[PDB]
Structure formats: C-alpha cells, structure tokens
Amino acid sequence: LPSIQLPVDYNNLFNEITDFLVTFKQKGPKYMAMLQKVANRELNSVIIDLDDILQYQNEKFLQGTQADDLVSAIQQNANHFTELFCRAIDNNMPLPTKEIDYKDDVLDVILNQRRLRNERMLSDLFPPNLTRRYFLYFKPLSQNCARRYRKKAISSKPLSVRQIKGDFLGQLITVRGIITRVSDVKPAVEVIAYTCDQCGYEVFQEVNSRTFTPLSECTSEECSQNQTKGQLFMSTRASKFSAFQECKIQELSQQVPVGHIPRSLNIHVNGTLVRSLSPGDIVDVTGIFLPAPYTGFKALKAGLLTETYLEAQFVRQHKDVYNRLAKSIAPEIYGNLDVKKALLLLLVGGVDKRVGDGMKIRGDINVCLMGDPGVAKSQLLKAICKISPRGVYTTG
Amino acid sequence: AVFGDRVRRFQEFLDTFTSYRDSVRSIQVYNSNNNILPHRIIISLDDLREFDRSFWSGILVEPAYFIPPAEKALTDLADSMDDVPHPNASAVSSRHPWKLSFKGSFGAHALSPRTLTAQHLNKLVSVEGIVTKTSLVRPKLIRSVHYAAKTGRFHYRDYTDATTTLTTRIPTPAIYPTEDTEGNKLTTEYGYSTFIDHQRITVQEMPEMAPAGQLPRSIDVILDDDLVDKTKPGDRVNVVGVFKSLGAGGMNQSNSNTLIGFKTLILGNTVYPLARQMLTDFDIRNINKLSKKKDIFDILSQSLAPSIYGHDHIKKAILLMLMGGVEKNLENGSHLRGDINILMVGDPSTAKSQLLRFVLNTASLAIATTGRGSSGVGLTAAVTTDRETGERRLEAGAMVLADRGVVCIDEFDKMTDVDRVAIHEVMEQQTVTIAKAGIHTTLNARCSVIAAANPVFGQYDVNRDPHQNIALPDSLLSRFDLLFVVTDDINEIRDRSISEHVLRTHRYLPPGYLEGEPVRSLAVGEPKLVTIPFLRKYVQYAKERVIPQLTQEAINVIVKNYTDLRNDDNTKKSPITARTLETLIRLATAHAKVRLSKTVNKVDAKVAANLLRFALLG
DNA sequence: TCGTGCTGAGTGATATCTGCTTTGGGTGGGTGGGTGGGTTGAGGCAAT
DNA sequence: AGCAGATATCACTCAGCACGA
Ligand SMILES: Nc1ncnc2c1ncn2[C@@H]1O[C@H](COP(=O)(O)OP(=O)(O)OP(=O)(O)O)[C@@H](O)[C@H]1O
Ligand SMILES: Nc1ncnc2c1ncn2[C@@H]1O[C@H](COP(=O)(O)OP(=O)(O)OP(=O)(O)O)[C@@H](O)[C@H]1O
Ligand SMILES: [Mg+2]
Ligand SMILES: [Mg+2]
Ligand SMILES: [Zn+2]
Structure with a gap:
C-alpha cells in the first residue's frame, strides 16, 4: 500500500466546515436555525447550499483570513464530505427547545439501558448513524452565483448520459434527461440490531454494501468472559432503515448524435428525496457519480469492469367565445369552422349520465373524421390531442 | 536495464524530431488555457525507420517490449515540459500517462480480418474493415x-x-x-x-473483397480511454493495434475439450476514418467558379451515371435528393422534413437498379436493401444482448443506420405488408418507436428513400389506370415526393442510339491492362462532365454551407403552378394534393442549394415546377 | 469407612486445518434436464 | 469468502491404591 502526498488536509477542511456552520449568516445563523429545527423533530432533511459556501469563502478572503477552497474540494470528492458534514452537525447539535416523549422511542430506552449496564460493569458505544434523524444533501453551485464571483460551475452544468465518463466518478455532477422507469419505495438497511439470548446485551452492525453476512455468535464482554455460547438473532424493531428508490434516466432526442442509439443511466434515491421522480418527466438530477463494486465470486469473475449509478442530491423539474376557441384550436390549418366546433364539443364532452336504472346513456360525444388524403387530419388529431389533458395519440 | 536503454533511445529520437515536442507543447498549452485534448501523439513510422532501424523494427515485430519504453519517454518529456504552478489533488493522484499513436506504411503488416493468422500474433498490424457491433461504454x-x-x-x-x-x-x-x-x-x-473508459467493437471484412463462396470474417478490437466512441456500426475504419492472445485456451484442466484454441483480439492504437473529403482553398474556389455557370444544374445532372443513356429528369431528381432541402421545425411542434423521396415504377431493363447502385456509391452515407431480403425488425431495430456487459440493448437497423443519409430499396413491390408498416411509419414520422423487452425509446430516422418497383403485370399498361398498375397502398405512395413512370418504347432511332452506347461502354478497358486480361495500401495515416470526386466535394460543400431562404417571387410562381396543376382537366399519373406544394418548395430549395444561393429565386421555382410537371404528366 | 493426593489410559470434545464451488453464461457441457432460469427473430410446416 | 469434512492435540471422568483414622 504505497502512500502519496496529496495537497489536502482534512482537519483544516473540517474546521472550515464547522466555522461555516456556526458563523455563516444570510437574525441568527441560517444553518444553526436549521439544526435547531431538526432537534425539535420539525425537519428531517438538511440541504447545504454551495452558494453559501462560496459566499463564506469570498467573505473570508476579503477579511484577509484566506481559507481553503471548500467548494472545489466538495465538488471533486463529495462522498467524504457528506460524512464530514454529518460529523460537524453532530458535534454542534443544539439542545432541544420543545419537550418530547423520549421514552416512546425504542432506541432511547435501549441506549439508556446499555448505559446502565455499562455503569454497572464499571462499578464492578453505538454507530453515529444509528441515532441520526436527518438526511444531508448538496445543492449544486448556481451558474449566476459562480459568474458573479468569477468561477466555473461544473456541478450545475447539465450533461448528457454520453458526456458522463469514467473520469467524472466521485464528483458532484448534473444530468439532463427523461425518466423512463421508477421502482417502488423499499426499506434499505443501514444499521442492524441483534440480541443475545443468554447475555441480555444488544449488538449492532453497519451495512455499506449490496450484501452483508449476518452475525451468528455473541461478541459481548460478558459472553466472552463467561464462555457462554450465545446466538445472535436479528431484530427489525430497533434497526435503522432508509427509503430507497431506483430510477432510470434516458437521453433526450436532441442529445443523441447522428446514427446513434440513446443510452440510460441508473439513479439511486435515498432519504426524503423519494417520490420526487416519476416516469415521463424531464428533470435535472444532481448527484454524486459513484461505482457499485460487486461482492464475492461475482467480484472475482467480473474483473475490472464496474457498474455505476447516481446518488440523487437535488431534482429540478422542468415546466363569440365559440368562434374564437374554434379558430384557435389549430391556427396553422385553413379555416374549417364546423370541424373545429365538433372538436370543441368532443373535448368538453358535457353530459348528465345518472339514469340509475341499470345502464346510463354514454357520456362521450365521439367524433369520427373520414376524408380523402390531403385534408389536415393528422394536424387536427395532434392539436386536439395536445390540448386535451388526457388525450392519447395512437396509430392503428 | 534494456528498458532504460530503450527509453533513452526513444528520448533521443523525440529530441531529434521537434514536431512531436511542438505538438505536445501545443496540447499542454490548450489544456492549461481552458474541451480538452487527450494525451495522445501520432508518430510517423517512416521517420523512426530513417532515424533508428532497430527501434522501428522492434516496434513493428515486438511492440510489447518497445512501445512501453516509448510511452514512458514521451510521458517524461511532457512532465518535464509541464510548468503548472499548482497541481490539483486529482491531478497529482491521476494516472494519465501519454499514449503513443502510429501512422505511415505497414509493409506486410497491413492486413484484413481474413488474412490475420497465428503468425501475426504479438505484432503491430493494421486492419481494414466495416464495424458491425459496438459494445456499451463502461468505466x-x-x-x-x-x-x-x-x-x-x-x-x-x-x-x-x-x-x-x-x-x-x-x-x-x-x-x-x-x-x-x-x-x-x-x-x-x-x-x-x-x-x-472501455469498449469492444467487431470489425468485419468488406463483403466485396471476400473470396468466392465464403462469407466475410471478423475480428474483435478493444478501445480504451479516448478511442472509446470514435466509431459507430456501418463505418469503414482502418484500425492499428497489437494482435494479442488471452486466457488459458483450454490448457487448464477444467476444460476437457482439448480441441479448442486460444482467444484473440486487437488492442487498438488508432482509428482512421475512411467519409468526409477535406476541402482545400483551390477546391472551394473551383466549386464557386463552377457554380457561377448558368447551366451548372445541367452539367451536374449529366455527370451522374455517365454509362446510363437518357433518364435526364431522373438524374436531376437524384441530384436534388442528394442536395436535399432545408429542414424546419416549428415552435408549436410541427416538423417539416427537408428530405426528398423518389420512386420509379417501370418495365424490366430500364436502368432502375443501376441508378440505385450509382446513388449508393456516390452518396456519402447510403444503405442498400431489397424487398425480399429485409424484414420489419431488420429495418427498424433488433433487441439483443451485450457480450461485454450482458445488458439488454438495441441494434440499429437499415433505417436507423442511414440517419441523415439515403436508403435504397430495390424490388419495393416484392415486400410484405408487415414489413411495409415499418417503412410507412419511418417516412411519415421520420422516427422509430420501439416497445419490446421493457425498452421504451424513440430512434431518429431522418433519411431520404429512393426505391424502384415493377407493375403488377410486369409491364406498364397505358389502357389501365395508374391505380390498377401499381399495387402499393395509396397512403404509402403519397409520401414519395416524385413518381417517375419509365417505359421501354421501341423506336428505331432510340434503339440504335442505346445499342451504340451499350456497345461503346462494353468496349472499355482499364488503364494498365492488356487486351484479354481479366479484371482482378501503401500508407495508412496519409458541356464537360465533372469527375465524381469533384461532384462529391461539391455536394458536401453545398449541403454543409448553404441554407436557402424563400422569397416572394418564388412563392408567386409556386402558388401559380399549384393552382394551375391541381384544377386542370388533363389527367395526372399521380393525384394532386397539398403535399405537392411542400414538394415544390423542397425542390426549389434544393435547386437553390445547387447554385450556392442564399435565397430561392424565380429560376428555382420554374425548374421545380418543370420537374414536377414532367414527373406527373410526362 | 472419609480425605488427599498420585497414576492412568481411556473416552471423549472442541479448538483447530484441508478442499470445494459458487455467479450465472457458453472462457463447464448436451450420456445433468426443458416444469431451475435465459427468449426475441427467423424459419419451415400444417390447417386454413 | 464461505461452508462442510476431517485430523490431532487438548482435558476430564471413573478408576483404585497408599496412609490414618
Ligand atoms: N388546410 C391545410 N393547410 C395547410 N396545410 C395543409 C392543409 N391540409 C393539409 N395540409 C398539409 O398536408 C400535409 C399532409 O397531410 P396530413 O398528414 O396533414 O393529413 P392527411 O392527408 O389526412 O394524411 P394521411 O396521408 O396520413 O391520410 C401536411 O403536411 C399538412 O401540412
Ligand atoms: N439506358 C440504359 N443504358 C445502358 N444500359 C442500360 C440501360 N437500361 C438498361 N441497361 C442495361 O440493363 C442491364 C440490366 O438492367 P437493370 O438491372 O438496370 O434493370 P432494372 O431497371 O433494375 O429492371 P428490373 O429490376 O425490373 O429487371 C444493365 O446491365 C444495364 O447495362
Ligand atoms: Mg394522417
Ligand atoms: Mg432490378
Ligand atoms: Zn452474549
């Protein structure tokens, strides 16, 4: 494992992040207020705006106390900075201002009893992610703010699926396309809680992979000491789960080159961003491009070839009365007033269908157009289908 | 030991030739200024041979031991040249060495997929063929x-x-x-x-060069880093790489076959396109001077298929189709295509197939298909699996492949309705819709369709109406901008002229051939008829750097012609329709493109009207 | 007939090393099966 | 990496005898 000397000092960056969270203002600090809201169970998602970081860096440079470029470091490698920001938030979480029912939560009771057991043992501990009740996301650097401060915004620059290469892995990038598939929301396990039948103690496990091996044997101090062989049993009540959704984003027609087939890129949605993407909507998904290593025999058989996906971080969603309406239905065509009026009547389709005797007169004013080639039948079809909210265009 | 000596020798070679140093400096300067140029340098094998024979020979016959030293020397030279003040952490951690690229003359290593044999393994070779497959790009x-x-x-x-x-x-x-x-x-x-990035492509031997009675062979090629997306299926390429062998090849006890050979493929160094002709200042000036002639249209039309007697109007239509109109897409959503479609229905032996072959050869991008040889799926796109990745994907069809090109369909009437439907959709919408194996996508298919067909009876009958003569659906017929009906008429003067022309053509002999002798590269990197290459250059120039706009006089002429043709007692071989107005506009735009004119003038409208009138009423 | 070792080889037992094989895909086959999956496209055949 | 079979080196139980009580 030979070492390298890279020009990054994570301690200074952590100090920068803590100072930004504590002092940044844009009343009191914005992020301090956000953390106060999170403490009172009022907010379950914290979003870090890179524009705020850039403004803070500019202010620090102006004051003369030049600091490290945090925006570039976040953009180049965002996976580490998620954990760094989570740690910084944890170290400065304000005390709750609104009383809450602590005893209701199972985790609170379990940890309190673990503390009691530890105190008893001493008289003779848990992963930080377990107790976290919030999600962290990165908002890309807006183009306007970057141009104001004379900087290039790689994160917010839209890219096609083709333009996302292997050299972009591990960075915060934006993708433009049309969602073609969204899966059902399912629970993804992050921390697993076990129990000992003999010991009476609780064990925990962290999952950061596609697959995991469950525990079988107790590892507690008591068990070890006493030599008691106790079996570990999974407990889903005390485990931590996060909503998971997998989506497919495909290239737009105008983005494909000449004589090429469109390509698709996988998207992973975690936390509160779930249900923000639906099929058929053109979106600007911002996320962290990361690989998905295999495990076990598959890993060995696959080789160096790696799958990839996008960790969703931000989603931007793209956008005389009778005669007048008839004429405005399809201005491009030559005036056909009667046909346009019939199309209006079909579109509105007003009817009172409440017979209640077993059947009810059909409530649809069906329209059929038949004519020799040359009339703009296709144009009427396309226009009237576009205007209609539920209009569906099909070919026999 | 020897590795260092070879590195030093290649450093000396690079120092002697300052062109490569200048190229590296230019690439570095461009990258620093700013989208980015890959770390690749093309070197001439001739210069290396002139400098050091031993190194050139080693690179040619033993690339494995002589290429990495050269790459390391080039990387060291570039690094010494680099003067970036602050290296970014990613830059420090980046493993981005310079990669060497070759050109020149491969004396006996210039081969094809058929001639690659075991004797060429572990040697630098040049392979020429056609791309048939292309795996997905993965990191x-x-x-x-x-x-x-x-x-x-x-x-x-x-x-x-x-x-x-x-x-x-x-x-x-x-x-x-x-x-x-x-x-x-x-x-x-x-x-x-x-x-x-990593990608795998399959290069296929050109069918025309294959032996007699044997199907073409193919070889697999591996592309990495910047060569990942330099090719698409249907392209003609010249790939340079090292022929290699992988795996145990049954040597392992787990394989009981004992009759199976090793795996083989090529690690590509270069990909040389074989499609766009570079235009020089002299060529551009010649094109302009020729275009300034009043009768440029006549000369250009006559220059097409000199071996075909007559058919002047069909040749003009083919030229206009090659030039193509202007494609306009409106804000509301309506899309107006600029491609011109042509259909020929006539008696046997009327030079329809020969015209299709000529337009296949001349057009920059062209795909040939037959009626009985094609299918609906083979036209549109097939669902298949990726070997590399094992992922369900799509394979481009005839229509898809010919995007922004031309598709020639022979024996158009010998098809099936099932197959016909695909084509109908293609021409009507210029897009391909696929709903198979959980695939939902739209493929762009913007190609001009030129087809030939025969009457139902096999011979055009004047007595019977046009509808009975042609069995194709009216809806499919209406999409063709021009319909040409050509018949074989027996006349003494015309018969004598055609016979004399055919006899003269059949007496041609190629240069450098003796009488009675049957008809059987040096480098890799590298009223008078107009020669075909000049015609291709002219077509490329006109179609690339001209977008004619309509004017009022052309509009007056077009509307006058439309009003006269649509409401006239004289019968027409094809019915008049509002699509005829669009056809007239397209032909006027194409004729304007012929003259390299920014505007459509009265002459273009008159020529379009004359062509349409000839196509309709003969 | 209790207590305390010394002898002891027998009867364990549990802490400790030696060889598959797998995923899925033809870089294991068709003397492992097709009701354990793959699987859309072309082709030939009979009833229609 | 995980799992099932196996080797071999680790203790522990009943066995019984000498002294004296
Ligand atoms: N009234 C009109 N004004 C302008 N353009 C028209 C008009 N009617 C038809 N067209 C043109 O006719 C062209 C072909 O006709 P279109 O596809 O609209 O309908 P259609 O002839 O009924 O179709 P089909 O051939 O599929 O039966 C269209 O491009 C449209 O521009
Ligand atoms: N005008 C012509 N000038 C010279 N040769 C001609 C001409 N018309 C036909 N031929 C000869 O006809 C021969 C075969 O005809 P061709 O294949 O071109 O016919 P086609 O129009 O495709 O007819 P079909 O497919 O109905 O048989 C060609 O070798 C060509 O030499
Ligand atoms: Mg229509
Ligand atoms: Mg023919
Ligand atoms: Zn325990």
Missing part, C-alpha cells in the same frame, strides 16, 4: 486511492488486466483494500481514484 478501474484518518496519509493500489497492458502481469482482483498494513481502517476516495 474500468486501474488505480484506487484510500485514506487513513488516524495516520492522515493516503494509500493507493494499482490494478492491471489482460487488455490494459501489453506485457503480462499477475492478475489483480478488483477487491478494494479495506485495512491498512498495521490494521488501520481505510476509506475509499472515489474522487481521487482513476477510471478509464
């Missing part, structure tokens, strides 16, 4: 960078593969290190790790 892991929080130092690992390096090395599983040497936990730094 490949070469270096991994890790961080240890307690120690505060970054640890890295390097990976290798059978295809990533020329020299064999111990295989490295992709398992990310998890723990340090002393037991310290490690965190993967994806942003600082290095991944490179």
Whole structure:
C-alpha cells in the first residue's frame, strides 16, 4: 500500500466546515436555525447550499483570513464530505427547545439501558448513524452565483448520459434527461440490531454494501468472559432503515448524435428525496457519480469492469367565445369552422349520465373524421390531442 | 536495464524530431488555457525507420517490449515540459500517462480480418474493415486511492488486466483494500481514484473483397480511454493495434475439450476514418467558379451515371435528393422534413437498379436493401444482448443506420405488408418507436428513400389506370415526393442510339491492362462532365454551407403552378394534393442549394415546377 | 469407612486445518434436464 | 469468502491404591 502526498488536509477542511456552520449568516445563523429545527423533530432533511459556501469563502478572503477552497474540494470528492458534514452537525447539535416523549422511542430506552449496564460493569458505544434523524444533501453551485464571483460551475452544468465518463466518478455532477422507469419505495438497511439470548446485551452492525453476512455468535464482554455460547438473532424493531428508490434516466432526442442509439443511466434515491421522480418527466438530477463494486465470486469473475449509478442530491423539474376557441384550436390549418366546433364539443364532452336504472346513456360525444388524403387530419388529431389533458395519440 | 536503454533511445529520437515536442507543447498549452485534448501523439513510422532501424523494427515485430519504453519517454518529456504552478489533488493522484499513436506504411503488416493468422500474433498490424457491433461504454478501474484518518496519509493500489497492458502481469482482483498494513481502517476516495473508459467493437471484412463462396470474417478490437466512441456500426475504419492472445485456451484442466484454441483480439492504437473529403482553398474556389455557370444544374445532372443513356429528369431528381432541402421545425411542434423521396415504377431493363447502385456509391452515407431480403425488425431495430456487459440493448437497423443519409430499396413491390408498416411509419414520422423487452425509446430516422418497383403485370399498361398498375397502398405512395413512370418504347432511332452506347461502354478497358486480361495500401495515416470526386466535394460543400431562404417571387410562381396543376382537366399519373406544394418548395430549395444561393429565386421555382410537371404528366 | 493426593489410559470434545464451488453464461457441457432460469427473430410446416 | 469434512492435540471422568483414622 504505497502512500502519496496529496495537497489536502482534512482537519483544516473540517474546521472550515464547522466555522461555516456556526458563523455563516444570510437574525441568527441560517444553518444553526436549521439544526435547531431538526432537534425539535420539525425537519428531517438538511440541504447545504454551495452558494453559501462560496459566499463564506469570498467573505473570508476579503477579511484577509484566506481559507481553503471548500467548494472545489466538495465538488471533486463529495462522498467524504457528506460524512464530514454529518460529523460537524453532530458535534454542534443544539439542545432541544420543545419537550418530547423520549421514552416512546425504542432506541432511547435501549441506549439508556446499555448505559446502565455499562455503569454497572464499571462499578464492578453505538454507530453515529444509528441515532441520526436527518438526511444531508448538496445543492449544486448556481451558474449566476459562480459568474458573479468569477468561477466555473461544473456541478450545475447539465450533461448528457454520453458526456458522463469514467473520469467524472466521485464528483458532484448534473444530468439532463427523461425518466423512463421508477421502482417502488423499499426499506434499505443501514444499521442492524441483534440480541443475545443468554447475555441480555444488544449488538449492532453497519451495512455499506449490496450484501452483508449476518452475525451468528455473541461478541459481548460478558459472553466472552463467561464462555457462554450465545446466538445472535436479528431484530427489525430497533434497526435503522432508509427509503430507497431506483430510477432510470434516458437521453433526450436532441442529445443523441447522428446514427446513434440513446443510452440510460441508473439513479439511486435515498432519504426524503423519494417520490420526487416519476416516469415521463424531464428533470435535472444532481448527484454524486459513484461505482457499485460487486461482492464475492461475482467480484472475482467480473474483473475490472464496474457498474455505476447516481446518488440523487437535488431534482429540478422542468415546466363569440365559440368562434374564437374554434379558430384557435389549430391556427396553422385553413379555416374549417364546423370541424373545429365538433372538436370543441368532443373535448368538453358535457353530459348528465345518472339514469340509475341499470345502464346510463354514454357520456362521450365521439367524433369520427373520414376524408380523402390531403385534408389536415393528422394536424387536427395532434392539436386536439395536445390540448386535451388526457388525450392519447395512437396509430392503428 | 534494456528498458532504460530503450527509453533513452526513444528520448533521443523525440529530441531529434521537434514536431512531436511542438505538438505536445501545443496540447499542454490548450489544456492549461481552458474541451480538452487527450494525451495522445501520432508518430510517423517512416521517420523512426530513417532515424533508428532497430527501434522501428522492434516496434513493428515486438511492440510489447518497445512501445512501453516509448510511452514512458514521451510521458517524461511532457512532465518535464509541464510548468503548472499548482497541481490539483486529482491531478497529482491521476494516472494519465501519454499514449503513443502510429501512422505511415505497414509493409506486410497491413492486413484484413481474413488474412490475420497465428503468425501475426504479438505484432503491430493494421486492419481494414466495416464495424458491425459496438459494445456499451463502461468505466474500468486501474488505480484506487484510500485514506487513513488516524495516520492522515493516503494509500493507493494499482490494478492491471489482460487488455490494459501489453506485457503480462499477475492478475489483480478488483477487491478494494479495506485495512491498512498495521490494521488501520481505510476509506475509499472515489474522487481521487482513476477510471478509464472501455469498449469492444467487431470489425468485419468488406463483403466485396471476400473470396468466392465464403462469407466475410471478423475480428474483435478493444478501445480504451479516448478511442472509446470514435466509431459507430456501418463505418469503414482502418484500425492499428497489437494482435494479442488471452486466457488459458483450454490448457487448464477444467476444460476437457482439448480441441479448442486460444482467444484473440486487437488492442487498438488508432482509428482512421475512411467519409468526409477535406476541402482545400483551390477546391472551394473551383466549386464557386463552377457554380457561377448558368447551366451548372445541367452539367451536374449529366455527370451522374455517365454509362446510363437518357433518364435526364431522373438524374436531376437524384441530384436534388442528394442536395436535399432545408429542414424546419416549428415552435408549436410541427416538423417539416427537408428530405426528398423518389420512386420509379417501370418495365424490366430500364436502368432502375443501376441508378440505385450509382446513388449508393456516390452518396456519402447510403444503405442498400431489397424487398425480399429485409424484414420489419431488420429495418427498424433488433433487441439483443451485450457480450461485454450482458445488458439488454438495441441494434440499429437499415433505417436507423442511414440517419441523415439515403436508403435504397430495390424490388419495393416484392415486400410484405408487415414489413411495409415499418417503412410507412419511418417516412411519415421520420422516427422509430420501439416497445419490446421493457425498452421504451424513440430512434431518429431522418433519411431520404429512393426505391424502384415493377407493375403488377410486369409491364406498364397505358389502357389501365395508374391505380390498377401499381399495387402499393395509396397512403404509402403519397409520401414519395416524385413518381417517375419509365417505359421501354421501341423506336428505331432510340434503339440504335442505346445499342451504340451499350456497345461503346462494353468496349472499355482499364488503364494498365492488356487486351484479354481479366479484371482482378501503401500508407495508412496519409458541356464537360465533372469527375465524381469533384461532384462529391461539391455536394458536401453545398449541403454543409448553404441554407436557402424563400422569397416572394418564388412563392408567386409556386402558388401559380399549384393552382394551375391541381384544377386542370388533363389527367395526372399521380393525384394532386397539398403535399405537392411542400414538394415544390423542397425542390426549389434544393435547386437553390445547387447554385450556392442564399435565397430561392424565380429560376428555382420554374425548374421545380418543370420537374414536377414532367414527373406527373410526362 | 472419609480425605488427599498420585497414576492412568481411556473416552471423549472442541479448538483447530484441508478442499470445494459458487455467479450465472457458453472462457463447464448436451450420456445433468426443458416444469431451475435465459427468449426475441427467423424459419419451415400444417390447417386454413 | 464461505461452508462442510476431517485430523490431532487438548482435558476430564471413573478408576483404585497408599496412609490414618
Ligand atoms: N388546410 C391545410 N393547410 C395547410 N396545410 C395543409 C392543409 N391540409 C393539409 N395540409 C398539409 O398536408 C400535409 C399532409 O397531410 P396530413 O398528414 O396533414 O393529413 P392527411 O392527408 O389526412 O394524411 P394521411 O396521408 O396520413 O391520410 C401536411 O403536411 C399538412 O401540412
Ligand atoms: N439506358 C440504359 N443504358 C445502358 N444500359 C442500360 C440501360 N437500361 C438498361 N441497361 C442495361 O440493363 C442491364 C440490366 O438492367 P437493370 O438491372 O438496370 O434493370 P432494372 O431497371 O433494375 O429492371 P428490373 O429490376 O425490373 O429487371 C444493365 O446491365 C444495364 O447495362
Ligand atoms: Mg394522417
Ligand atoms: Mg432490378
Ligand atoms: Zn452474549
């Protein structure tokens, strides 16, 4: 494992992040207020705006106390900075201002009893992610703010699926396309809680992979000491789960080159961003491009070839009365007033269908157009289908 | 020991020729200024042979031992040249060495997929063929960078593969290190790790060059880094690489076959297109001067298919189709195509197939299909699986492949309705819709369709109406801008002229051939009829740098012609319709493109009207 | 007939090393099966 | 990497005898 000397000092960056969270203002600090809201169970998602970081860096440079470029470091490698920001938030979480029912939560009771057991043992501990009740996301650097401060915004620059290469892995990038598939929301396990039948103690496990091996044997101090062989049993009540959704984003027609087939890129949605993407909507998904290593025999058989996906971080969603309406239905065509009026009547389709005797007169004013080639039948079809909210265009 | 000597010798070679140093400096300057140019340098094998015979011979016959030294020397030269003040952390951790590229003359190593044999293994070769397959692009892991929080130092690992390096090395599983040497936990730094793109293509021997009675053969090629997306299926390429062998090839006890050979493929160094002709200042001036002639249209039309007697109007239509109109898409959503479709229905032996072959050869992009030889799926797109990745995908069809090109359909009437439907959709919408195996996509298919067909009876009958003569659907017929009905009429003067022309053509002999002798590259990188290459250059120039706009006089002429043609007692071989107005506008725009004119004038409208009138009423 | 070792080889037992094989895909086959999956496209055949 | 079979080296139980009580 030979070492390298890279020009990054994570301690200074952590100090920068803590100072930004504590002092940044844009009343009191914005992020301090956000953390106060999170403490009172009022907010379950914290979003870090890179524009705020850039403004803070500019202010620090102006004051003369030049600091490290945090925006570039976040953009180049965002996976580490998620954990760094989570740690910084944890170290400065304000005390709750609104009383809450602590005893209701199972985790609170379990940890309190673990503390009691530890105190008893001493008289003779848990992963930080377990107790976290919030999600962290990165908002890309807006183009306007970057141009104001004379900087290039790689994160917010839209890219096609083709333009996302292997050299972009591990960075915060934006993708433009049309969602073609969204899966059902399912629970993804992050921390697993076990129990000992003999010991009476609780064990925990962290999952950061596609697959995991469950525990079988107790590892507690008591068990070890006493030599008691106790079996570990999974407990889903005390485990931590996060909503998971997998989506497919495909290239737009105008983005494909000449004589090429469109390509698709996988998207992973975690936390509160779930249900923000639906099929058929053109979106600007911002996320962290990361690989998905295999495990076990598959890993060995696959080789160096790696799958990839996008960790969703931000989603931007793209956008005389009778005669007048008839004429405005399809201005491009030559005036056909009667046909346009019939199309209006079909579109509105007003009817009172409440017979209640077993059947009810059909409530649809069906329209059929038949004519020799040359009339703009296709144009009427396309226009009237576009205007209609539920209009569906099909070919026999 | 020898590696260092070879590195030093290649450093001396690079120093002697300053062109490569200047190219590297220019690439570095461009990259620093700013989208980016890959770290690749094209060197001439002739210069290397002139400088040092031993190094050139070694590179040609033993690339595995002579290429890596040259690459290292070039990388060292570039690094010494680099003067970037602050190197970014990713730049420091990046594994981006310069890659060498070759050109010149491969004396006996210039081969094809058919002539590649075991004797050429582990040698630098040049392969020429047609791309038939193209795997999906996926990243490949070469270096991994890790961080240890307690120690505060970054640890890295390097990976290798059978295809990533020329020299064999111990295989490295992709398992990310998890723990340090002393037991310290490690965190993967994806942003600082290095991944490179990987792709596999299949190059096929050109069918025309295949032996008699044997189907073409193909060879697999591996492309990495910047050569990932330099080709698409149907392209003619000249690939340079090192022929290699992979795997045990049954040597292992697990394979009981004992009759199976090794795997073989090529690690591509260059991809040389074989489509767009570079235009020189002299060529541009000649094109302008020729275009300034009043009768440029006549000369250009006559220059097409000199061996075909007559058919002047069909030749003019083919020229206008090649030039093509202007494609306009409106804000509301309506799309107006600029492609011109042509259909020919006539008696046997009327030069329809020969015209199709000529337009196939002349057009920059063209795909040939037959009626009985094609299918609906084969026209549109097929669902298949990717070998490399094992992922369900789409394979481009005839229509798709010919995007922004021309598709020639022979025996148009010998098809099936099932097959016909695909074409109908293609022409009507210029897009392909696929709903198979959980695939939902729209494929762009913007191609001009030129087809030939025969009457139902096999011979056009004047007595019977046009509808009875042609069995194709009216809806499909209406999409063709021009319909030409050509008949074989027996006349003494015309018969004598045609016979004399055919006899004169059949007496042609090629240069450098003796009488009675039957008809059987040097480098890799490299009223008078107009020669075909000049015609191709003219077509490219006109179709690239001209977008004619309509004017009022042309509009007056067009509307006058439409009003006269649509409401006239004289019968027409094809019915008049509002599509005829669009056809007239398209033909006027194409004729304007012929003259390299920014505006459509009265002459263009008159020519379009005359062509349409001839096509309709003969 | 209790207590305390010394002898002891027998009868364990549990802490400890030696070899598959797998995923899925033809870089294991068709003397492992097609009701354990793959699987859309072309082709030939009979009833229609 | 995980799992199932196996080897071999680790203790523990009943066995019984010498002294004296
Ligand atoms: N009234 C009109 N004004 C302008 N353009 C028209 C008009 N009617 C038809 N067209 C043109 O006719 C062209 C072909 O006709 P279109 O596809 O609209 O309908 P259609 O002839 O009924 O179709 P089909 O051939 O599929 O039966 C269209 O491009 C449209 O521009
Ligand atoms: N005008 C012509 N000038 C010279 N040769 C001609 C001409 N018309 C036909 N031929 C000869 O006809 C021969 C075969 O005819 P061709 O294949 O071109 O016919 P086609 O129009 O495709 O007819 P079909 O497919 O109905 O048989 C060609 O070798 C060509 O030499
Ligand atoms: Mg229509
Ligand atoms: Mg023919
Ligand atoms: Zn326990």
